[PDB]
Amino acid sequence: MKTVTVKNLIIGEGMPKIIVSLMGRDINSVKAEALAYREATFDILEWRVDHFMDIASTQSVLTAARVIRDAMPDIPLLFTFRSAKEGGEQTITTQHYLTLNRAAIDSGLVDMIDLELFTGDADVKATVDYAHAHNVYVVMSNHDFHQTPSAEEMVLRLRKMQALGADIPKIAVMPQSKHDVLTLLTATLEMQQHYADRPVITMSMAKEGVISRLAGEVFGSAATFGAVKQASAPGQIAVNDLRSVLMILHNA
Ligand SMILES: *[C@H]1C=C(C(=O)O)C[C@@H](O)[C@@H]1O
Ligand code: NA
Ligand code: NA
């Protein structure tokens, strides 16, 4: 296990780390979210950049990042543009996506970025090396908002993210059945049994999938998303409820 340390937080041992997603259409609403969010307890702040309207301006995006870092100087910060094809709020060109992600890395404002595996091998491997050259960690991610791939497919996808240099492979899948939820947990456990080189984030989305967000210490998901007031993805529960369950499981 190559654990990831960001500001005294160790991702990939002990209790799963709680992530909450900040969503703001503009700099003023990003600022008000950050002030409200630093009154909640969690391990990692994700800025969902795709919710930001003025995405065309690299500098406006960096101004918004700065307002979040100013509000919370010592939170581990994850810069995440979620593309619409993986369930995000808007479309941008690959080129603009890598520009924003490189801008974020160079800013020194963020500790981690999200790179979607399906961006394409050469673009991901180059952005990963770029992140790593500036000591920014990569959460390499895949989302399927429609169905749950087989356990084999999710294990090979997560190992693929490892091979392209992901610090923290991440997969989030929509169950169609309770069976699909088990499949995801099986996939998670298979990485813990057989492929435990990098911590991995797994989740089965929606109401049926919620157990996947609670059980990460047993089956080996290194982090889980709670909601401060709005959920960034369906099946997230209130961040205090999530912390309660995590602590009862760790201390059992
Ligand atoms: C990845 C996963 C999400 C989830 O299913 O909880 C939320 C999204 O903001 C993250 O980027
Ligand atoms: Na994704
Ligand atoms: Na999808």
Numbering used by the authors: 1 to 252
Article, verbatim:
An essential histidine residue (H133/H143 in Sa-DHQ1 and St-DHQ1, respectively), is also involved in the formation/hydrolysis of the Schiff base intermediates.
Herein we report the synthesis of compounds 6–7 in which enhancement of the electrophilicity of an endocyclic carbon atom in the ligand towards covalent modification is attempted by direct introduction of the amino functionality into the quinate scaffold. These compounds are substrate analogs in which the carbonyl group at C3 has been replaced by a hydroxyamino and an amino group with R configuration (compounds 6 and 7, respectively). Compound 6 was found to be a time-dependent irreversible inhibitor of the two enzymes with K I values of 90 ± 8 and 130 ± 12 µM and k inact values of 8 ± 1 and 13 ± 1 ms−1 against Sa-DHQ1 and St-DHQ1, respectively. The two adducts Sa-DHQ1/6 and St-DHQ1/6 crystallized as dimers with two molecules in the asymmetric unit (namely chains A and B) and were solved at a resolution of 1.65 and 1.90 Å, respectively. Unbiased, calculated electron-density maps showed clear electron density for the ligand covalently bonded to the catalytic lysine residue (K160/K170 in Sa-DHQ1 and St-DHQ1, respectively) via an amine, which is visible in the two chains. Surprisingly, no electron density for the tertiary hydroxyl group in position C1 was identified in the two enzyme adducts. For the St-DHQ1/6 enzyme adduct, a long hydrogen bond between the C5 hydroxyl group and the side chain of residue S21, which is located on the flexible substrate-covering loop, is also identified. As a result, this loop folds more above the modified ligand. The MALDI spectra of St-DHQ1 enzyme incubated with 6 in ∼1:120 enzyme/ligand ratio for 24 h and at 25°C showed a peak for a covalently modified enzyme corresponding to an additional mass of 158 (theoretical value of the increased mass = 156).
